[PDB]
Amino acid sequence: APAEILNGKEISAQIRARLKNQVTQLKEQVPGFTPRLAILQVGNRDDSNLYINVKLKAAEEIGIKATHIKLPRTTTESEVMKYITSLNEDSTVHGFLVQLPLDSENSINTEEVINAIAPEKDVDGLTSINAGRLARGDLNDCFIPCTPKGCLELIKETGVPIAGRHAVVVGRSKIVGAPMHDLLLWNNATVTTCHSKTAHLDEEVNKGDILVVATGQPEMVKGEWIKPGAIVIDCGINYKVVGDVAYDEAKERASFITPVPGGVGPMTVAMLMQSTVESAKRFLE
Amino acid sequence: APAEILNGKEISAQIRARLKNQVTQLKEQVPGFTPRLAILQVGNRDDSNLYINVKLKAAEEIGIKATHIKLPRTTTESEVMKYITSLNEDSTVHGFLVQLPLDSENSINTEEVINAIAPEKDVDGLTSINAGRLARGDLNDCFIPCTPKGCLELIKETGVPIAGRHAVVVGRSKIVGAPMHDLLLWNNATVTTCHSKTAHLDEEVNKGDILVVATGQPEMVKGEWIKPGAIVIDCGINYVPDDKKPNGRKVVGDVAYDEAKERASFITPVPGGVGPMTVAMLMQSTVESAKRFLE
Ligand SMILES: NC(=O)c1ccc[n+]([C@@H]2O[C@H](COP(=O)([O-])OP(=O)(O)OC[C@H]3O[C@@H](n4cnc5c(N)ncnc54)[C@H](OP(=O)(O)O)[C@@H]3O)[C@@H](O)[C@H]2O)c1
Numbered sequence: 001a002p003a004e005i006l007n008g009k010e011i012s013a014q015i016r017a018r019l020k021n022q023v024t025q026l027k028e029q030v031p032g033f034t035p036r037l038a039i040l041q042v043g044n045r046d047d048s049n050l051y052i053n054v055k056l057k058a059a060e061e062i063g064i065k066a067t068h069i070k071l072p073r074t075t076t077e078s079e080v081m082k083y084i085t086s087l088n089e090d091s092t093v094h095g096f097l098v099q100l101p102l103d104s105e106n107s108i109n110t111e112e113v114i115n116a117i118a119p120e121k122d123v124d125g126l127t128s129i130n131a132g133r134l135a136r137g138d139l140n141d142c143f144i145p146c147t148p149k150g151c152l153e154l155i156k157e158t159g160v161p162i163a164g165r166h167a168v169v170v171g172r173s174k175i176v177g178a179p180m181h182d183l184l185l186w187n188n189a190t191v192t193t194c195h196s197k198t199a200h201l202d203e204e205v206n207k208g209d210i211l212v213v214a215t216g217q218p219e220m221v222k223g224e225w226i227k228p229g230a231i232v233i234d235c236g237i238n239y240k241v242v243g244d245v246a247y248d249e250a251k252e253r254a255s256f257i258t259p260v261p262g263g264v265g266p267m268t269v270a271m272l273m274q275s276t277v278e279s280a281k282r283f284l285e
Numbered sequence: 286a287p288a289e290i291l292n293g294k295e296i297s298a299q300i301r302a303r304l305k306n307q308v309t310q311l312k313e314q315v316p317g318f319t320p321r322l323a324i325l326q327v328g329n330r331d332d333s334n335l336y337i338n339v340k341l342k343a344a345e346e347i348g349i350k351a352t353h354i355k356l357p358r359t360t361t362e363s364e365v366m367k368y369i370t371s372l373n374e375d376s377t378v379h380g381f382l383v384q385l386p387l388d389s390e391n392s393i394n395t396e397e398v399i400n401a402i403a404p405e406k407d408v409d410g411l412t413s414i415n416a417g418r419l420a421r422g423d424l425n426d427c428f429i430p431c432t433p434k435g436c437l438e439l440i441k442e443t444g445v446p447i448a449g450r451h452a453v454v455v456g457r458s459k460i461v462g463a464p465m466h467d468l469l470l471w472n473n474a475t476v477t478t479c480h481s482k483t484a485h486l487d488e489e490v491n492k493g494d495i496l497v498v499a500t501g502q503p504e505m506v507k508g509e510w511i512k513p514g515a516i517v518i519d520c521g522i523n524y525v526p527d528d529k530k531p532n533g534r535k536v537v538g539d540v541a542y543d544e545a546k547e548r549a550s551f552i553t554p555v556p557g558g559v560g561p562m563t564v565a566m567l568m569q570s571t572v573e574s575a576k577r578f579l580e
């Protein structure tokens with residue numbers, strides 16, 4: 001009766017073991033070379049502290065050197081810009097990211113901050129340059145955001161070809177929904193994007209052979225809506241922790257489904273690490 | 286109950302007359318301010334010369350100063366790059382474009398040339414940075430490529446709100462389909478993008494309250510596929526021989542117009558729909574760049 005469970009915890013563990021061996025091999029080819037990631041944080045949110053620790057731990061396990069810079073809540077845009085410039089110019093840093101959302105007492109234009117990141121170091125793929133390449137099909141020389149990247153990998157774990165499928169993406173954010181659409185489209189799905197102004201959400205969802213949900217609305221996508229045999233990818237982290245999909249009903253209709261926790265979340269961290277290792281390898285050129 | 290015809294020739298003429306008045310007024314509000322467009326050409330292709338002259342003439346009618354830089358076929362990539370850098374840095378120039386395709390005896394990386402354009406001057410909207418802003422919903426200050434821009438304008442001429450409609454885009458090219466998707470999405474349509482690998486294209490098309498077709502496949506989208514009451518926007522320019530026409534050839538769209546006009550509530554003809562919009566949209570983007578520069 002139930003959907004096969006796409007176990008992101010196990011899959012991510014296989015990815016991290018491969019990345020580790022790749023990193024060990026780079027270091028034996030070029031001794032003293034150390035791939036390096038930096039994470040710049042503004043403020044002191046509890047959830048951001050937890051996510052960053054998970055990232056630092058994965059990095060150290062793979063043999064990536066990881067630096068965490070934590071700026072106070074008094075930080076201004078102009079101070080964040082100086083750090084980004086410093087990370088851009090530090091040739092020991094192969095990739096870096098800015099943890100979102102920024103936690104400051106001052107107004108900081110997030111887009112302007114992100115877009116000061118040098119594109120070759122933008123391992124989160126959130127610069128307009130990288131978004132622009134992805135959105136137009138040029139996946140050759142481009143970092144892709146870590147969440148959609150992990151989702152695509154989960155979709156591929158089913159062995160079902162994406163080409164020609166009707167995919168539905170619920171959500172259109174910069175971090176998840178919009179790039180998710182792009183990845184599905186340039187893997188030759190026919191893609192429908194939904195958002196908060198979509199009418200008859202249920203009827204749109206029901207057309208998805210592939211369904212990716214990234215709304216942050218706890219369990220709003222009902223199992224009833226899911227197309228029989230669909231692949232269901234659920235990005236939601238909502239406070240127990242639950243997804244954006246009503247799992248117990250959706251599991252009876254899908255052929256493949258991601259649980260929450262242990263689905264998309266661990267896969268996201270593995271892809272960040274993969275992008276980091278890519279940046280380090282490109283720099284060795 | 287046949288479709289109202291969206292007359293692109295008339296609408297574009299209204300747009301160009303309003304832009305003129307706006308430009309006259311900017312110059313009176315800030316005397317000495319001169320909106321300025323540059324077009325950089327490489328080589329001497331006949332078709333490019335024709336298109337450029339049309340753009341220069343529209344600009345001069347509106348009161349935009351238009352400069353044409355024409356480099357010879359002997360030009361190298363590094364010389365093209367130097368001109369782009371110079372246009373980027375010339376504070377009198379608010380917008381410029383590079384006419385494509387380049388006509389040189391040397392290898393010139395087109396993508397690299399285009400992507401040296403400063404985003405704030407990229408009136409054709411084809412730089413990666415500008416594509417990226419548009420694709421992620423920064424519609425306040427990015428540039429929009431001229432064809433999808435004109436499509437959106439035609440859709441708005443109907444007075445039917447876009448928000449909550451199911452829009453279908455057939456095609457995903459850099460120049461039309463992809464930016465078209467972005468405009469519809471950030472106007473709050475629910476958007477489906479189809480392409481050459483879409484299965485059951487007819488059934489996908491039939492879900493479109495708004496349909497934009499940009500395939501280059503003459504009359505492939507049949508009237509039977511059109512949802513009743515749909516807005517149909519047809520970007521196709523396909524040449525077919527026809528001895529009964531003044532110049533021995535007709536232009537048809539990517540939509541089978543005669544059958545689609547019986548099903549749509551609004552439809553663009555070909556010729557005379559999307560095509561005449563395009564030069565006016567370039568002019569509109571140029572006026573936007575000049576206004577943003579004016580702070
Ligand atoms: N595992 C990870 O590392 C990770 C990373 C990022 C995100 N996520 C999770 O994924 C979820 C989404 O995050 P985000 O950054 O993409 O969030 P976000 O920026 O809040 O965007 C939510 C999106 O869902 C849409 N939406 C909201 N209510 C909806 C409704 N009733 N019907 C349809 N669409 C609706 C929004 O519509 P509008 O655009 O119209 O506002 C928007 O596009 C969250 O639970 C987040 O915690 C996880």
Ligand SMILES: NC(=O)c1ccc[n+]([C@@H]2O[C@H](COP(=O)([O-])OP(=O)(O)OC[C@H]3O[C@@H](n4cnc5c(N)ncnc54)[C@H](OP(=O)(O)O)[C@@H]3O)[C@@H](O)[C@H]2O)c1
Nearest residue numbers: 432456457458460461480481499500501520521522560563
């Ligand atoms: N000023 C003007 O009037 C103007 C300006 C621009 C464009 N246009 C016209 O608009 C049309 C499209 O031009 P473009 O620049 O977008 O061309 P293009 O680069 O060739 O793009 C064609 C697009 O349509 C898709 N397509 C092709 N055959 C299809 C089929 N059988 N079923 C579904 N989708 C199919 C292609 O799919 P894949 O992506 O899968 O290959 C692609 O995304 C042309 O007639 C062009 O002349 C007019």
